[PDB]
Design a protein around this ligand. Structure first.
Ligand SMILES: CCCCCCCCCCCCCCCCCC(=O)OC[C@H](CO[C@@H]1O[C@H](CO[C@H]2O[C@H](CO)[C@H](O)[C@H](O)[C@H]2O)[C@H](O)[C@H](O)[C@H]1O)OC(=O)CCCCCCCCCCCCCCCCC
Ligand SMILES: CCCCCCCCCCCCCCCCCC(=O)OC[C@H](CO[C@@H]1O[C@H](CO[C@H]2O[C@H](CO)[C@H](O)[C@H](O)[C@H]2O)[C@H](O)[C@H](O)[C@H]1O)OC(=O)CCCCCCCCCCCCCCCCC
Ligand code: CLA
Ligand code: CLA
Ligand code: CLA
Ligand code: CLA
Ligand code: CLA
Ligand code: HEC
Ligand SMILES: CC1=C(/C=C/C(C)=C/C=C/C(C)=C/C=C/C=C(C)/C=C/C=C(C)/C=C/C2=C(C)CCCC2(C)C)C(C)(C)CCC1
Ligand SMILES: CC1=C(/C=C/C(C)=C/C=C/C(C)=C/C=C/C=C(C)/C=C/C=C(C)/C=C/C2=C(C)CCCC2(C)C)C(C)(C)CCC1
Ligand SMILES: CC1=C(/C=C/C(C)=C/C=C/C(C)=C/C=C/C=C(C)/C=C/C=C(C)/C=C/C2=C(C)CCCC2(C)C)C(C)(C)CCC1
Ligand code: OEY
Ligand SMILES: [Cl-]
Ligand SMILES: [Cl-]
Ligand SMILES: [Fe+2]
Lengths: 442, 334, 81, 341, 137, 36, 34
């Protein structure tokens, strides 16, 4: 009994029409991935970094090792085109199947096939569909593995020489490293899974995950829910929808922080420097300049009595001074050469900084992820001129927003599911008001 | 009658003057802990080196503060986003200098407040109610998450989360405008619309119902005694109220359905506060308000100032003065 | 219910769209011309892009007198002639 | 059957927009206050009063467009068209800020008209006039911020200019010069506005989740009837819910709805009083005990002292541009600045 | 006021020859300046070394002098320190260094004129604001 | 300090498992209309 | 049998007429160049 504004809830128990909704919507996702890439490519200019150009999809492709050389220098734009065209083309096939199943195909499936038809309350059929999709996920995760090891490798920002595409011959299988990440603290200096800083660990984790997903995929095909599971859950289409909104929301917050902190699977060559990275780069820049003028940067006492360029962290490591003392957990390929075991190494600072390192720091400092909604780069008090907002800010903010609403959607549908399963989603029975049969609190 | 089943029945009982519930099991301890730490700190904590520059800021009453100026100061910039429980300090004295109380208070409050929201779902289930009062509360809870957690994550430091005091609050919102031009951000503008709108509709609805109370009393008694708790009949005349407000404006701009009207009252401030909490959360990643500094120039290319450029002159004065000893390099990138 | 003719019926009607398919572009064109012709600048006193400042001047022509105010702005304008 | 009652009759007929005796004041003035703001934001500059561009015609957008206040030189002049300042010339009038007083005065009189309208309609329909009383809260704010506050000051120049960013500048002005956030009459305003918004959300959400099931379908809206005597949500289940979540809850529907009137109305009234103080520079700017200690004790720092540094930054950095008529010239060396920035 | 020949007239070399840009060249150079330079030089400052700016009176005192087209176009080819004593193509975008500053690649010789044109005309319109910093925003 | 840390870990874990097992004990069935 | 010219008519055209006109002027304005 649903309004026009909740009309999609009229598809709960129309399995055939609901298949088309999902496949027509799957087409929309592929369409955008296709058209967007074509759009980004149509506007690409190779002379300019990707992050001066508002690109978010091309950075994902270059990260897999297509179209880029050492440095991130774009070498061949044909793989970007091929990804766009194939995605765009595949969306008509899904579009076609979506409209057919929404409008002309059987409204319901369970009369046409006992295989494709389902009842939400069939706990066995539902876990079987879960199992199928788990294998597909496991397959896909191994695809990334397969690319890294057998079909070209991946862009490795850590490679000696500026970064380069590199085949991964020794994925990390040691479970104490792989599952160690899952128990690292999410706080500073630790970073939970966000701190992964090498492709061996990335590739290895996807071997594990693809195995696990196939493992469980088979599990759920072969099993039915145990009794303790049967009694703790609500078994209904809305209930499963809510469960999933919860997980997507959680995943979305994770991605938000991944693109904001991680400079390995979001290499800075492509995406721009991280907040912390740009902040560290400014300290590098003025250390370099002032040293050239003859300042002794180990010994220069700043206004506060803390070192003007270099101080200690609370655990003693030598770090950049100023406000960026907060960012001392930062690690990047342009900085690690300067680090010894006590932190930044004063003899390397006086002797070993390279032009390429100066250059990187000047660039990242002047490309920090600060920017206005209308794409004026810099602090909010900055004048018009530089048309720049970091891909990391566009990606970080959009996914906080989406993550946030899907948690509302989780609370929205979780609670509705609990109430409709108990029978009071529509309001309170006047003749049987629970509270009027309870004793008064006082 | 088994010992666990009987515990479960007390926890979830609809008969406790205050409902507990499974959510209440986390909430009670974490809120009692955040509360007790806060009360002690506000009164007696020594000064805290918030900005990590060995310049401690006095926040409590016994150190020369009043109700307006006192605060539990945020933890040292030197800590940034590191976890800093008591057991990581060499001593309570260290923990107090570096601002440990703030971390303890905010984490426990965020948790217990999260469980508060869920507790609202829970009791609604146990009483046969509809479930979504908690969706309404998530707008303020999301606001508290943005200024105590999200904003520090994106700026890299809890030293930049909102202080727990009245003047510290204003300090946080002054620096915020200098760094983000938040007044010129459309999500703060929707917050103002949510919040002004909410006060307007509160007064409207309150005055429309009050205007149409049905006569049940004499001049010498409160009109309030015309309603008796649990009476079945409505206590005002909704078509007389719709009759007046339709004519004050025009017919179709006025509700005659009390369900739509009350749903509207809930949706307007909730949605607007979601946005303005999203505004703080996305400005945490420095996607700032509109910047029209020097967007207007003449045929020669002189700058012709607007009100935006005046705003910016004041943002500049906030910028150059805040945390006056803490910056060694020319741009405040965080 | 007040006896006027309902809106949903006026703007599905042929007659309505027969008048207003004329009156609405006439107004849009009328106001356009108010700008494109320059009259809006003149009616209102608003400086054109070339006449905020005198050529080598970087002074706002700020009104500083109450009862000589009219003549003040007039003098600034002749400083642009 | 005299003419006066013939007109009474026609004014008070039931029509799509009711007119009334109050219409006579209300409608001309409301249309003119609004015609002037749209007229001025689309076409008119602030070059000669403020040194600012301020219309779409000049290049501004909807955020930066404003009808700006007259020059400080104008003082509190009514700035009538036919008056000694504009001397009948429409063009000069606009360039002097004439439309600011135009909007503000027709605005004031229109608000009167509106409130008299609420009195007029309520008398005819036979309801109590509490909507009209609530409307005093907006009226007090308007008269205190737009009329009383500059009348206390040197001139109209220092009132709010009618525009989005211009009003944003006014909010920052009051922080740097008046330290308005520290004023307890503003704090009572904040607790009333936010309290209102709280009350608004929480009462709408309670009703929506204590509804009776009076229809069969999942859209609960259909199941209300405007004429039903029966209440549509359970005050009993609402009261028990909040007593157990929050400890206290409403039990009296009349007190509840009267409290929704009381809370936001009163907060606006308290802030009106505060701004009246500020007309006169009677600020709650400082705490004397704090200043004596900090003067004598350079290790003594609070958020109270930090915020005044910021206020000091705002005053010196915005004043020359914001008050052009003062010819403030602040060479760089005198500007307050922290390290590096 | 408007963009007239006088303001569009700038020195070509130190001898004191002059050249008069077209409006078109002025907008061309402003554009190229935002594309290749403003990330460090917005408003005529230098964000990564604020001691050195693009005020004409600073350029005049550079070694070699740089308050003219020839000097500016040379600098975009082979930049030096302010005293002239070391070439710095390695850390400053230049044609001599366009391998490592990829934006400087598609700049033609006339492109360099327009860029140098802008730098010299802008101080004449904005005055103190050009290279002044936030104090003059 | 090390003693406090253990204490807190213990106290927390306790309430957490109270929570996980509280909801694993037939929570859908704790409602006033329909129980399973 | 309705009227064409009412109070309502006037109110409507009192706002609408100058709206469209104003939209015309603001449209033209996007093409103004310095
Ligand atoms: C079911 C119920 C769930 C129960 C969970 C309860 C326990 C967990 C609670 C988590 C608390 C979050 C604290 C986040 C603090 C922070 O520093 O979080 C950020 C961390 C990332 O940590 C950073 O990780 C970084 C990793 O980078 C390092 O390594 C990189 C690798 O290239 C680079 O080299 C980089 O330079 C280098 O520094 C560094 O370690 C930093 O020091 C460290 O701060 O994210 C993370 O751990 C990843 C995940 C963070 C998600 C937090 C989102 C919170 C949003 C809540 C939504 C509220 C909604 C309100 C509802 C109404
Ligand atoms: C009436 C119509 C109905 C409207 C109903 C309400 C919906 C509002 C939608 C906005 C309406 C305006 C859209 C058109 C103008 C616009 O936007 O115009 C902007 C551009 C088109 O304008 C171009 O915008 C560009 C913005 O810069 C970008 O491009 C530059 C190119 O160098 C740089 O790379 C820079 O870094 C990069 O950010 C440039 O400025 C171009 O000059 C300019 O032409 O449209 C875009 O990008 C298109 C973006 C579409 C996707 C938006 C999703 C982004 C998700 C962010 C979520 C965060 C939300 C938080 C909010 C708080
Ligand atoms: C996988 C995601 C997902 C899915 C499948 C559903 C599915 C459903 N939802 Mg849930 N929902 C979700 C996420 C999801 N939701 C999220 C994230 C939220 C939080 C906001 C909600 C909140 C929500 C509420 C409050 C309600 C539902 C309802 C419903 C049902 C009917 C919906 C309908 O017909 O809407 C039809 C769609 C519309 C009416 C259009 C809405 C358009 C949005 C608000 C505007 C977005 C504009 C965009 C951001 C920018 C525009 C750009 C411009 C150019 C246009 C259906 C089962 C209803 C329900 O309970 O039924 C059982 C209901 O009342 N949903
Ligand atoms: C992702 C978006 C999405 C999707 C996929 C669907 C899908 C669906 N909706 Mg929902 N809906 C949506 C958004 C969506 N809706 C929104 C945003 C609203 C709020 C306005 C609603 C409100 C709504 C209501 C109120 C109802 C539905 C219903 C339905 C189903 C039956 C439709 C039908 O027979 O129409 C027939 C429609 C037509 C004959 C018109 C043409 C439609 C086609 C698909 C246009 C496609 C154009 C495209 C470019 C062609 C590509 C072709 C190429 C691939 C070969 C269908 C599965 C109905 C339902 O459940 O039925 C029982 C129903 O009652 N929808
Ligand atoms: C998850 C998506 C999905 C699901 C569950 C279904 C399910 C169904 N479809 Mg639909 N359909 C889909 C997608 C889907 N289809 C798409 C994408 C299209 C357009 C290409 C269609 C077009 C379509 C038509 C035209 C018809 C159906 C029909 C049917 C029913 C019978 C199918 C049958 O016997 O095939 C049995 C199995 C096969 C024929 C094997 C196909 C082999 C596939 C192509 C290889 C799979 C590879 C991999 C998984 C795909 C990903 C590749 C990509 C990543 C590059 C069944 C309920 C029929 C029906 O109900 O008629 C009344 C019918 O006539 N479908
Ligand atoms: C899409 C993924 C997915 C989904 C939706 C399900 C869904 C389900 N699984 Mg399957 N499963 C999956 C993947 C999935 N599974 C995979 C890949 C595997 C292989 C390992 C399994 C293996 C598996 C087994 C062996 C069993 C299930 C069971 C179940 C059911 C009980 C769920 C339950 O109580 O969990 C809720 C979770 C708990 C009660 C305890 C979790 C405690 C952890 C520590 C919470 C951590 C959250 C934390 C905040 C985030 C940080 C993570 C931390 C590790 C750092 C349910 C139908 C059970 C069942 O009935 O099977 C028939 C069962 O016994 N699953
Ligand atoms: C009807 C409501 C109304 C109200 C209350 C106002 C109020 C105002 N208008 Mg607005 N105005 C209105 C309608 C209204 N206007 C209309 C319809 C128009 C368009 C024509 C305007 C156009 C307009 C402009 C253009 C301006 C104003 C201005 C003003 C202000 C100055 C008024 C003044 O000095 O009057 C003084 C005069 C009276 C109050 C008249 C009193 C009538 C006496 C008692 C009768 C005398 C009879 C006679 C002597 C006897 C016979 C003599 C014999 C020769 C026959 C004031 C706030 C000015 C303003 O805003 O400046 C900032 C201004 O410049 N008004
Ligand atoms: C940051 C990455 C920069 C970019 C991009 C551009 N310039 Fe620059 N410039 C930069 C620095 C650090 C310096 C100082 C060099 C030193 O002496 O140590 C400079 C210097 C100049 C100068 C000299 C100004 C002077 O006062 O003598 C000029 C004229 C100049 N740079 C011009 C210029 C142009 C035209 C650019 C775009 C094409 C450009 N620079 C880019 C930093 C950076
Ligand atoms: C059901 C429904 C719905 C939905 C629907 C959908 C959403 C659909 C989809 C659709 C889709 C999903 C579609 C797509 C398709 C695609 C296509 C059709 C494509 C095309 C292609 C082409 C043709 C290509 C070409 C090219 C190439 C090849 C190369 C380059 C160039 C170019 C690009 C040109 C709605 C909501 C409406 C409503 C209700 C109902
Ligand atoms: C790939 C990769 C990797 C890996 C990773 C992994 C391996 C992961 C895992 C993960 C996982 C393994 C996860 C887990 C999850 C879980 C969860 C998330 C859960 C949840 C739960 C819940 C939700 C609950 C609920 C409940 C309760 C509590 C009570 C009763 C009732 C219920 C049931 C409702 C790495 C890092 C190396 C690197 C990179 C890549
Ligand atoms: C002043 C004056 C006067 C008067 C005047 C007037 C009265 C005016 C009017 C005017 C007006 C009356 C105008 C109007 C206009 C307006 C406009 C300008 C509009 C626009 C709008 C828009 C643009 C919108 C849109 C939209 C959006 C944006 C979003 C949402 C949706 C929509 C679609 C709505 C006189 C003569 C007495 C004389 C004296 C002076
Ligand atoms: O805004 Mn200005 O930016 Ca965020 O950090 Mn850099 O300075 Mn300091 O610590 Mn608190 O405050
Ligand atoms: Cl500060
Ligand atoms: Cl610093
Ligand atoms: Fe109510």
């Amino acid at each position: 009994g649903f309004a026009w504004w909740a009309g999609n809830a009229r598809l709960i128990n129309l399995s055939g029409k609901l298949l088309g909704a999902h496949v027509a919507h799957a087409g929309l996702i592929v369409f955008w991935a296709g058209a967007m890439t074509l759009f980004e490519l149509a506007h690409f200019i190779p002379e300019k970094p990707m992050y001066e150009q508002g690109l978010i999809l091309i950075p994902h492709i270059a990260t897999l090792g297509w179209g880029v050389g050492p440095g991130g220098e774009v070498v061949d734009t044909f793989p970007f085109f091929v990804v766009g065209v194939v995605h765009l083309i595949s969306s008509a096939v899904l579009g076609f199947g979506g409209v057919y199943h929404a409008i002309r195909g059987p409204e319901t499936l369970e009369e046409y096939s006992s295989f494709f038809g389902y009842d939400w309350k069939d706990k066995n059929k539902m876990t079987t569909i879960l199992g199928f999709h788990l294998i597909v996920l496991g397959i896909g995760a191994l695809l990334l593995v397969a690319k890294a090891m057998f079909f070209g490798g991946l862009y490795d920002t850590w490679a000696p020489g500026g970064g380069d595409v590199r085949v991964i011959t020794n994925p990390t299988l040691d479970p104490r490293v792989i599952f160690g990440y899952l128990l690292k603290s999410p706080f500073g200096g630790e970073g939970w899974i966000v701190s992964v800083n090498n492709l061996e660990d990335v590739v290895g984790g996807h071997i594990w995950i693809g195995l696990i997903c196939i493992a469980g995929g088979i599990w759920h095909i072969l099993t039915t829910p145990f009794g303790w599971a049967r009694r703790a859950f609500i078994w209904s289409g809305e209930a499963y929808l809510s469960y999933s909104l919860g997980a997507l929301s959680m995943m979305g917050f994770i991605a938000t922080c991944f693109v904001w902190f991680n400079n390995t699977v979001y290499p800075s060559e492509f995406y721009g420097p991280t907040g912390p990275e740009a902040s560290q780069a400014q300290a590098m820049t003025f250390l370099i300049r002032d040293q050239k003028l003859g300042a002794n940067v180990g010994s220069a006492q700043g206004p506060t009595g803390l070192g003007k360029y270099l101080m200690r962290s609370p655990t003693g490591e030598i770090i950049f001074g100023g406000e960026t003392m907060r960012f001392w957990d930062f690690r990047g390929p342009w900085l690690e050469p300067l680090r010894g075991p006590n932190g930044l190494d004063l003899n390397k600072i006086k002797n070993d900084i390279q032009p390429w390192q100066e250059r990187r720091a000047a660039e990242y400092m002047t490309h920090a992820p600060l920017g206005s909604l209308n794409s004026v780069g810099g602090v909010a008090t900055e004048i018009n001129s530089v048309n720049f907002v970091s891909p990391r800010s566009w990606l970080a903010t959009s996914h906080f927003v989406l993550a946030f609403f899907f948690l509302v959607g989780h609370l929205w549908h979780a609670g509705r599911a609990r109430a409709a399963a108990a029978g009071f989603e529509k309001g309170i029975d006047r003749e049987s008001e629970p509270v009027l049969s309870m004793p008064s609190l006082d | 009658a088994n010992l666990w089943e009987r515990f479960c029945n007390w926890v979830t009982s609809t008969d406790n003057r205050l409902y507990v519930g499974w959510f209440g099991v986390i909430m009670i301890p974490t809120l009692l802990a955040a509360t007790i730490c806060f009360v002690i700190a506000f009164i007696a904590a020594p000064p805290v080196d918030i900005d990590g520059i060995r310049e401690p800021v006095s926040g409590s009453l016994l150190y020369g503060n009043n109700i307006i100026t006192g605060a539990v100061v945020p933890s040292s910039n030197a800590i940034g986003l590191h976890f800093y429980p008591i057991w990581e300090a060499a001593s309570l004295d260290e923990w107090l200098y570096n601002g440990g109380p703030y971390q303890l208070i905010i984490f426990h409050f965020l948790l217990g407040a999260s469980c508060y929201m869920g507790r609202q779902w829970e009791l609604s289930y146990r009483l046969g109610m509809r479930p979504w009062i908690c969706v309404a509360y998530s707008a303020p809870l999301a606001s508290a998450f943005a200024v105590f957690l999200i904003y520090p994550i994106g700026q890299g430091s809890f030293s930049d989360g909102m202080p727990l005091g009245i003047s510290g609050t204003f300090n946080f919102m002054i620096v915020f405008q200098a760094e983000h031009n938040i007044l010129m951000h459309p999500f703060h503008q929707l917050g103002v619309a949510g919040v002004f709108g909410g006060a307007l509709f509160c007064a409207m609805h309150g005055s429309l119902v009050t205007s149409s109370l049905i006569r049940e009393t004499t001049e010498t008694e409160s009109a309030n005694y015309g309603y008796k708790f649990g009476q079945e009949e409505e206590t005002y005349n909704i078509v007389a109220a719709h009759g007046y407000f339709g004519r004050l404006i025009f017919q179709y701009a006025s509700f005659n359905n009390s369900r739509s009207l009350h749903f509207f009252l809930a949706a307007w401030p909730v949605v607007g506060v979601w946005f303005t909490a999203l505004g703080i959360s996305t400005m945490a990643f420095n996607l700032n308000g509109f910047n029209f500094n020097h967007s207007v120039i003449d045929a020669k290319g002189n700058v012709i100032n607007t009100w935006a450029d005046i705003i910016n002159r004041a943002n500049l004065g906030m910028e150059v003065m805040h945390e006056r000893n803490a910056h060694n390099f020319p741009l405040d990138l965080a | 219910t007040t006896g006027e003719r309902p809106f949903s019926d006026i703007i599905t009607s042929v007659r309505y769209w027969v008048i207003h398919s004329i009156t609405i572009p006439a107004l849009f064109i009328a106001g356009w011309l108010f700008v494109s012709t320059g009259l809006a600048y003149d009616v209102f006193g608003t400086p054109r892009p070339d006449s905020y400042y005198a050529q080598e001047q970087r002074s706002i022509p700020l009104v500083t007198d109450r009862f000589e105010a009219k003549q003040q702005v007039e003098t600034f304008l002749e400083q642009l002639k | 059957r005299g003419w006066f009652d013939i007109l009474d009759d026609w004014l008070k007929r039931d029509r799509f927009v009711f007119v009334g005796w109050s219409g006579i004041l209300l409608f001309p003035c409301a249309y003119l206050a609004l015609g002037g703001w749209l007229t001025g934001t689309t076409f008119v500059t602030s070059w000669y009063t403020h040194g600012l561009a301020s219309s779409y015609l000049e290049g501004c957008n909807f955020l930066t467009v404003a009808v700006s206040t007259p020059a400080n030189s104008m003082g509190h002049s009514l700035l009538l068209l036919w008056g000694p300042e504009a001397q009948g010339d429409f063009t000069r009038w606009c360039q002097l800020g004439g439309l600011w007083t135009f909007i503000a005065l027709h605005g004031a009189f229109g608000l009167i008209g509106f409130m008299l309208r609420q009195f007029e309609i309520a008398r005819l329909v036979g309801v109590r006039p509490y909507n009209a009383i609530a409307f005093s809260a907006p009226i007090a704010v308007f008269v205190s911020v737009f009329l009383i506050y500059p009348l206390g000051q040197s001139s109209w120049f220092f009132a709010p200019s009618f525009g989005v960013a211009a009003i944003f500048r006014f909010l920052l002005f009051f922080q740097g010069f008046h330290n308005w956030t520290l004023n307890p009459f503003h704090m009572m305003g904040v607790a009333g506005v936010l309290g209102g918004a709280l009350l608004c959300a929480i009462h709408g959400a309670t009703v929506e989740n204590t509804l009776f099931q009076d229809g069969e379908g999942a859209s609960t809206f259909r199941a209300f009837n405007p004429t039903q005597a029966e209440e549509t949500y359970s005050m009993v289940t609402a009261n028990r819910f909040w007593s157990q979540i929050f400890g206290i809850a409403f039990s009296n529907k009349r007190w509840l709805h009267f409290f929704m009137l009381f809370v936001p109305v009163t907060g606006l009234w308290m802030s009106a009083i505060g701004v009246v103080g500020l007309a006169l520079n009677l600020r709650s700017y400082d705490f004397i005990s704090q200043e004596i200690r900090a003067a004598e004790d350079p290790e003594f720092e609070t958020f109270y002292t930090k915020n005044l540094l910021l206020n000091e930054g705002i005053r010196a950095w915005m004043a020359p541009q914001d008050q052009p008529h003062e010819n403030f010239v602040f060479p760089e060396e005198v500007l307050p600045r922290g390290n590096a920035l | 006021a408007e963009l007239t020949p006088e303001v569009l007239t700038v020195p070509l070399n130190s001898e004191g020859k002059t050249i008069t840009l077209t409006e078109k060249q002025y907008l061309e150079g402003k554009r190229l300046f935002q594309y290749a330079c403003a990330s460090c030089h917005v408003g005529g400052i230098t964000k990564t070394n604020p001691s050195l700016d693009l005020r004409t009176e600073t350029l005049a005192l550079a070694t070699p002098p740089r308050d003219n087209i020839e000097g500016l176009v040379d600098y975009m080819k082979n930049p030096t320190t302010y005293d002239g004593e070391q070439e710095i193509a390695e850390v400053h975008p230049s044609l001599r260094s366009a391998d490592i500053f990829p934006k400087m690649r598609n700049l033609t010789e006339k492109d360099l004129v327009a860029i140098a044109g802008h730098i010299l005309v802008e101080p004449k319109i904005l005055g103190d604001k050009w290279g002044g910093g936030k104090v003059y925003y | 300090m090390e003693t406090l840390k253990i204490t807190v870990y213990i106290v927390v874990t306790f309430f957490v498992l109270l929570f996980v097992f509280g909801f694993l004990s037939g929570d859908p069935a704790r409602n006033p209309k329909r129980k399973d | 049998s309705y009227p064409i010219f009412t109070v309502r008519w006037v109110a409507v055209h009192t706002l609408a007429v100058p709206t469209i006109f104003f939209l015309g002027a603001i449209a033209a304005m996007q093409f103004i160049q310095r």
